[PDB]
Design a protein around this ligand. Structure first.
Ligand code: Z80
Length: 179
């Protein structure tokens, strides 16, 4: 395995410090995959921001996702399961449990999810940050991770924060949960 090139693609067991690190609000920035299904489906996502509340005693994360797709907001919450040893996270989408490797970069205000990382025919990365806009410093780290997987930068699908439809609903939820 080529290092430093692939340094950040390397899984490590998930600790409580790591769970704390990913706690809070995240914005989905960019992704790329060799999997063709994810290429056509992720292409429809205009924005997404979500909340992670990990439960360190249960190895779960409570997710509250706010996805913008088809000119509308789609809200869903669920309990993700954490597989500490394998450095992975899992959730149910469309009936089936799906797994993602939890990965990181130099900047702690960012994180990645790795999909099908064992399979060079299907692998991909999704890129997340604490703001909907990222710096060239932050981007560089993600683009490097794509270089590791030999995925062209041209294959990246990007969000556009101005197209978000979920902010007004998140606003409504804040009102409800703080009442
Ligand atoms: C292409 N996308 C369907 C996969 C993205 C990774 N996706 C995910 C997948 C499989 C298992 C766990 C997770 S955690 C997670 C939390 C927030 C968001 Cl927005 C996405 C994910």
């Amino acid at each position: 395995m080529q290092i430093p090139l692939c340094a950040n693609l390397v899984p490590v067991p998930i600790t409580n410090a790591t769970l704390d690190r990913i706690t809070g609000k995240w914005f989905y920035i960019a992704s790329a995959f060799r999997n063709e299904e994810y290429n056509k489906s992720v292409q429809e996502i205009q924005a997404t921001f979500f909340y992670f509340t990990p439960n360190k005693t249960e190895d779960t994360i409570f997710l509250r996702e706010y996805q913008t797709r088809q000119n509308q907001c789609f809200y869903n919450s669920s309990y993700l399961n954490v597989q500490r040893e394998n450095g992975t996270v899992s959730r149910y989408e469309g009936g089936r449990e799906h797994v993602a490797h939890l990965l990181f970069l130099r900047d702690t205000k960012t994180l990645m999810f790795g999909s099908y990382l064992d399979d060079e025919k299907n692998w991909g990365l999704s890129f997340y940050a604490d703001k909907p806009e990222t710096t060239k410093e932050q981007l560089g780290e993600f683009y490097e991770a794509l270089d590791c997987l030999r995925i062209p930068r041209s294959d990246v699908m990007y969000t556009d924060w101005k197209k978000d439809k979920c902010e007004p609903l998140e606003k409504q939820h804040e009102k409800e949960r703080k009442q």
